[PDB]
Design an enzyme around this catalytic site. Structure first.
Site, PDB file in Angstrom:
ATOM      1  CG  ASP A 133     -34.693   8.970   6.212  1.00  0.00           C
ATOM      2  OD1 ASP A 133     -35.879   9.157   6.542  1.00  0.00           O
ATOM      3  OD2 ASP A 133     -33.721   9.372   6.898  1.00  0.00           O
ATOM      4  CB  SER A 161     -21.535  13.709   2.647  1.00  0.00           C
ATOM      5  OG  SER A 161     -22.396  12.885   3.239  1.00  0.00           O
TER       6      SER A 161
HETATM    7  N1  A2D Z   1     -32.420  14.248   5.760  1.00  0.00           N
HETATM    8  C1  A2D Z   1     -31.666  13.207   6.015  1.00  0.00           C
HETATM    9  N2  A2D Z   1     -30.764  13.053   6.941  1.00  0.00           N
HETATM   10  C2  A2D Z   1     -29.864  12.166   6.954  1.00  0.00           C
HETATM   11  N3  A2D Z   1     -29.659  11.266   6.037  1.00  0.00           N
HETATM   12  C3  A2D Z   1     -30.654  10.910   5.146  1.00  0.00           C
HETATM   13  C4  A2D Z   1     -31.749  12.051   5.171  1.00  0.00           C
HETATM   14  N4  A2D Z   1     -32.260  11.618   3.992  1.00  0.00           N
HETATM   15  C5  A2D Z   1     -31.654  10.543   3.551  1.00  0.00           C
HETATM   16  N5  A2D Z   1     -30.881  10.089   3.970  1.00  0.00           N
HETATM   17  C6  A2D Z   1     -30.023   8.791   4.133  1.00  0.00           C
HETATM   18  O1  A2D Z   1     -29.092   8.935   2.933  1.00  0.00           O
HETATM   19  C7  A2D Z   1     -28.549   7.756   2.678  1.00  0.00           C
HETATM   20  C8  A2D Z   1     -28.312   7.551   1.456  1.00  0.00           C
HETATM   21  O2  A2D Z   1     -29.279   8.083   0.647  1.00  0.00           O
HETATM   22  P1  A2D Z   1     -30.305   7.005  -0.485  1.00  0.00           P
HETATM   23  O3  A2D Z   1     -29.483   6.319  -1.074  1.00  0.00           O
HETATM   24  O4  A2D Z   1     -31.433   6.576   0.964  1.00  0.00           O
HETATM   25  O5  A2D Z   1     -31.012   7.760  -0.951  1.00  0.00           O
HETATM   26  P2  A2D Z   1     -32.482   8.075  -1.311  1.00  0.00           P
HETATM   27  O6  A2D Z   1     -32.919   7.514  -2.570  1.00  0.00           O
HETATM   28  O7  A2D Z   1     -33.444   7.974  -0.289  1.00  0.00           O
HETATM   29  O8  A2D Z   1     -32.581   9.495  -1.427  1.00  0.00           O
HETATM   30  C9  A2D Z   1     -31.196  10.244  -1.649  1.00  0.00           C
HETATM   31  C10 A2D Z   1     -30.928  10.844  -0.445  1.00  0.00           C
HETATM   32  O9  A2D Z   1     -29.571  10.787  -0.262  1.00  0.00           O
HETATM   33  C11 A2D Z   1     -28.876  11.882  -0.423  1.00  0.00           C
HETATM   34  N6  A2D Z   1     -27.319  11.763  -0.888  1.00  0.00           N
HETATM   35  C12 A2D Z   1     -27.119  11.422  -2.358  1.00  0.00           C
HETATM   36  N7  A2D Z   1     -25.726  11.137  -2.258  1.00  0.00           N
HETATM   37  C13 A2D Z   1     -25.337  11.239  -1.005  1.00  0.00           C
HETATM   38  C14 A2D Z   1     -24.147  11.269  -0.654  1.00  0.00           C
HETATM   39  N8  A2D Z   1     -22.983  11.019  -1.434  1.00  0.00           N
HETATM   40  N9  A2D Z   1     -23.751  11.447   0.700  1.00  0.00           N
HETATM   41  C15 A2D Z   1     -24.718  11.804   1.468  1.00  0.00           C
HETATM   42  N10 A2D Z   1     -26.079  11.455   1.051  1.00  0.00           N
HETATM   43  C16 A2D Z   1     -26.177  11.717  -0.177  1.00  0.00           C
HETATM   44  C17 A2D Z   1     -29.537  12.763  -1.351  1.00  0.00           C
HETATM   45  O10 A2D Z   1     -29.434  14.097  -0.979  1.00  0.00           O
HETATM   46  C18 A2D Z   1     -31.007  12.347  -1.065  1.00  0.00           C
HETATM   47  O11 A2D Z   1     -31.059  13.069   0.278  1.00  0.00           O
HETATM   48  C19 A2D Z   1     -29.573   6.910   3.253  1.00  0.00           C
HETATM   49  O12 A2D Z   1     -29.022   5.731   4.095  1.00  0.00           O
HETATM   50  C20 A2D Z   1     -30.742   7.423   4.015  1.00  0.00           C
HETATM   51  O13 A2D Z   1     -31.168   7.068   5.203  1.00  0.00           O
END
Ligand code: A2D
Ligand code: A2D
Ligand code: A2D
Ligand code: A2D
Lengths: 255, 255, 255, 255
Positions: free
Chosen positions: A45, A158
């Site tokens: 993603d 989260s």
């Molecule tokens: N739309 C959507 N739905 C479900 N899961 C998703 C989505 N987009 C990314 N992800 C997942 O988020 C997880 C963590 O993000 P990752 O480290 O992939 O961040 P990226 O550089 O792509 O990019 C950073 C992204 O991570 C998000 N993020 C940053 N910190 C957190 C925490 N602490 N919890 C949840 N998500 C976070 C941030 O908003 C950005 O969306 C990773 O396993 C991805 O598969």
């Protein structure tokens, strides 16, 4: 059609990209990373988010596809050959998701596909939350997150946020660790805003903020206002088969 | 215009009702509680909910107003005389909010303005959650709440739900105390559904359920399905002045 | 030693019980379900809770063991033969967990191993929360849950409660869907109480309550007070091997 | 007795400090900010935290008092003259609260009165959580907070943590925005630990962390381990009158 492919840049992904390019060679169908009509992302993603932000000036002209080696993927690496053919024959309908416009005034403008967040430089974080010019709350805590509907499964989730179907043209604001006592008071509930509603954050002290847009995170200095609204621009996806959002949510979080 | 007034039935409210009726006597403007075009509720939100459910067969024909002696009020008791005049002179525009349709199959159909909830007769509560015919989760816990947008400030709110602007045609599902372990798994996040999406609950055991619609709460026996969707019907409000939803939320929860 | 065995009463469990009894026949070691020193539960945590409540007058005299066919189990069904021998040879140390005393005044007294909860008969639930004679809050919502430390992984957990190590002599109070607005206010946070602190609930209206103690759930009428405190009595477990609480928590909730 | 007074350094506080000093002049009773037996803090909880951290090498020798111009205050500014006399005449009993020991290995050791938190330098935060040498979970999210019992009303509270009576010798760990999906899994519940339990955080990547102890926040580089435990050292408070913790909680959060 013009097309390009981004890769997570590991072995599996680079090799999968080269095979699709070779498969595309058998159609016409030319590679162009300046003005593609199709942008294929291979990786996760994060790879997809980067692909989006690479071509954000061209969103009306591009249909995005993701392969996961994923909420923005979509295709397993073994399905790649079927994807080349289907994509070559133009056998696809387009789906659009809403995006969030962030405006930072001192004016800088950003598009997010997942979310934009605000924290302090460190720094207690205190801002006044103004909805459609009405003063709503003084927020004290770690920060705020403003999410698109497809972003709701990400950082928003989260933070205790709701998951919204991306056909709803909305944005959702969540709190990060708000202080609430007999003195200080926030809504302590996610807020979901329609198109045309404007959420404005204004400094109380203290005008430096760490602002994130999806993966990008920069310290903004001498901020007067951060302004949130559902963007008039939309991302377009190519597909191909039914893969419903709620199924996608089930597959990622339940089993 | 035809009109009627319901009262909370205490002293303040009955007397305020009689004065409005008398004020209405000076216009024309007749009282009719069989087919009113204007329904005025004096009391609280419970009084207003009762007024709504009294005239739910006539929603397309009625504009509702609430006086609080309130999210469905709206007018303070001291503003009542101004309300009579404005209402008499027809100096009002109409606003519509979405409602939730509940279907209980063994078929019974209900409209909610706030929410509909499901619990067991007592009884562990276990149901299968089916979104648009796709099996989403097996829910184990105390129950589920399905909310309209104006209902989001009510029971939904207490359950960790998001507050949604009522111009968004949606419904929101929240969990009540779900069990989650390495065996049992729910989404553990509110879910926001667009118009035309259908959420279906199906018994696993155990086909008796305490089902609530706003204030009404009845035990249904030998249930095969509970079905939720954004209703095609809408409630219409009369007003009169700007009193924005987010201001209303601020006034009720912040200061 | 005197011993007895309860069974979940299904095939696997009854047969496992008969084999342990037969294995016990080879030692001495007599079956007695009136005054056992060892109580073995075969089934789930519900089976174990029933075993506890069967012998609650004899807690100082009994060491409990659970087999799961489990937070109160402990032994897999394949380990049963090793359990017979170890238990026969007296090769075990005892561990004690705290219990919660519930007092219902109109006086009835109950012990819980997991928790005691209070809801209304239906019925808005409103009670005054009095800690050590000091008036703490007026609670409006669905109900309240008071948990022992080993109960924290159960109903308490689903309510947003903390998990507490059971060597801590404490009880934890959680809210079920509290109403909070500019009028009505609760702490909106779990509360953890030491031994000797007394939490008292007192009716505001409305003196009928559905009160639960672990699995048992009865409507109490004309209640003046519900009183919570860490019990002076403790449950004693036999074992046998190291199986740390945090490992038990990991095994049940993580992987 | 030897004593000193810290001030928030605003006008009200400096003037109140000078008057207490003058009042103290009438007893004996000497000012000494090198080795005081009584440390008086005038200002807020931040002022009090600073006072604590000023004299953390002398905790066994000092009784702290706070005036608020407050969970660590305690006295209103108008009560200052009564405080001088009571304090002069030695008319006070001492109460002790537990503290948290933080150990950072690359070894640095810190005491917290409120909490210690860990975030990344920015940086996804990923650590392995090890309780008493047992691997409990891999945490992915924004960070972790470890709280003393008196710290539970602070940052811990904003993170969904339980409020614990400070007579309980424990520490409580809360999550900041953990990622949970079908892949990544945390307990998603506050954890309360007894004295002698050791919670260890170990880097997965990525060995740089922003670590906070109460107000102090420093980036630690090349971290091998962060280690948490209930400190053997305790803070001692002087007082004077009954002001129960639960009353203090009520006064700060309810009314
Ligand atoms: N739309 C959507 N739905 C479900 N899961 C998703 C989505 N987009 C990314 N992800 C997942 O988020 C997880 C963590 O993000 P990752 O480290 O992939 O961040 P990226 O550089 O792509 O990019 C950073 C992204 O991570 C998000 N993020 C940053 N910190 C957190 C925490 N602490 N919890 C949840 N998500 C976070 C941030 O908003 C950005 O969306 C990773 O396993 C991805 O598969
Ligand atoms: N839309 C909206 N927004 C904000 N506040 C509102 C709203 N509607 C009603 N209320 C308020 O809910 C409060 C409690 O409900 P009340 O006892 O008024 O219930 P009613 O018979 O009218 O009717 C029962 C209603 O209460 C809701 N309810 C029932 N139990 C709860 C709990 N435990 N928490 C929150 N809301 C609940 C239920 O859904 C019905 O909506 C009361 O102070 C009302 O002013
Ligand atoms: N100490 C502990 N830790 C973790 N898991 C446990 C524990 N005790 C029981 N359980 C598990 O709770 C689950 C549901 O309870 P179940 O239906 O077993 O209830 P019982 O008749 O035994 O007995 C009723 C029990 O269920 C609890 N309960 C009742 N309703 C709920 C909800 N909605 N969520 C969580 N727990 C609940 C209630 O307090 C009683 O503790 C079941 O899978 C058990 O394995
Ligand atoms: N024990 C206790 N109970 C209730 N309220 C308290 C307590 N201690 C401090 N406070 C209050 O915390 C509020 C914010 O902290 P403040 O800015 O005072 O921080 P300080 O430099 O003293 O010192 C920083 C402190 O603030 C805490 N903190 C930092 N960020 C947050 C957020 N986002 N929410 C809550 N608390 C936070 C941090 O742990 C430190 O405890 C302030 O109104 C204090 O009165």
């Amino acid at each position: 059609m013009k097309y390009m492919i981004t890769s997570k840049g590991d072995e599996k992904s680079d090799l999968l990209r080269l095979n699709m390019i070779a498969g595309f060679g058998e159609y016409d169908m030319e590679y162009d990373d300046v003005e593609p009509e199709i942008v294929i992302s291979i990786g996760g993603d994060g790879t997809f988010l980067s692909a989006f932000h690479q071509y954000e000036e061209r969103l009306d002209e591009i249909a995005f596809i993701g392969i996961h080696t994923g909420f923005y993927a979509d295709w397993r690496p073994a399905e790649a050959d079927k994807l080349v053919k289907l994509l070559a024959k133009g056998e696809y309908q387009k789906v659009s998701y809403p995006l969030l416009k962030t405006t930072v005034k001192y004016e800088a403008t950003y598009l997010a596909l997942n979310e934009s967040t605000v924290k302090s430089s460190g720094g207690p974080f205190v801002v006044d939350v103004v909805i459609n010019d009405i003063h709503f709350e003084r927020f004290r805590g770690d920060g705020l997150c403003m999410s698109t509907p497809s972003g709701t499964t990400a950082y928003n989730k989260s933070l205790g946020g709701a998951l919204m179907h991306p056909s709803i043209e909305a944005m959702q604001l969540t709190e990060m660790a708000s202080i609430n006592n007999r003195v200080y008071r926030t809504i302590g509930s996610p807020l979901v805003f329609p198109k045309h509603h404007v959420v404005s954050l204004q400094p109380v002290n203290d005008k430096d903020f760490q602002i994130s847009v999806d993966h990008l995170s920069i310290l903004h200095r001498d901020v007067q206002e951060i302004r949130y609204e559902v963007s008039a621009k939309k991302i377009h996806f190519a597909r191909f088969r039914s893969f419903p959002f709620w199924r996608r949510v089930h597959d990622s979080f339940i089993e």
